[PDB]
Amino acid sequence: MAESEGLMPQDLINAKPVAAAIKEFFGSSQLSQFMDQNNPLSEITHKRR
Amino acid sequence: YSYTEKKRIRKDFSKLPDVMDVPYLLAIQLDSYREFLQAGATKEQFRDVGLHAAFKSVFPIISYSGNAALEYVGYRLGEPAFDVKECVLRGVTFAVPLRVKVRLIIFDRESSNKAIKDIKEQEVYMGEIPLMTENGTFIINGTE
RNA sequence: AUACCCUCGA
């Protein structure tokens, strides 16, 4: 319902949901987990998992 | 004959030839993320999967009973705010800003090119991508 | 000092 003159593209889009989704996936997903750094081989076998 | 091996030679019992050298071990992760990011953009960025693919997937937006659309232009990745070592020291998630150019084009709903008002500008900072490090991992809140 | 998730040992 907003007008082209009444609203600007920067004021229409809310970027909060995409940032929240990216943060949630990168911090709380099952596949996101702390790297095994006790061995250099542990890192390689974790990233190739 | 390289310099590093000149320090110590392993006696190898290989009785079969090395037709192909062992490929890079972490390529399966580094290839995926760099294809997902599409850092190298030509005049026409690759139509393959990635953030660009998702943006084109949600490209045409039609207002409900209205003549107004949001066309997407190529996005522009930001520059890393911190170095990865600095992020590990501080906990800055080693993120890079994301911004895209969108055009809000309204019409007169006359089934043609009427009421020509195309407002194209770079959109707001749509979050920040964690920008995987060169070793196949990335820092989130200071932890690898 | 409560619930999930992940990883690991027997």
Curated annotation (Swiss-Prot), chain A:
Signal peptide: none annotated. Belongs to the RNA polymerase beta chain family. DNA-dependent RNA polymerase catalyzes the transcription of DNA into RNA using the four ribonucleoside triphosphates as substrates. The RNAP catalytic core consists of 2 alpha, 1 beta, 1 beta' and 1 omega subunit. When a sigma factor is associated with the core the holoenzyme is formed, which can initiate transcription. This is DNA-directed RNA polymerase subunit beta. It comes from Pseudomonas aeruginosa (strain ATCC 15692 / DSM 22644 / CIP 104116 / JCM 14847 / LMG 12228 / 1C / PRS 101 / PAO1). The chain holds residues 486 to 534 of 1357 of the full protein.
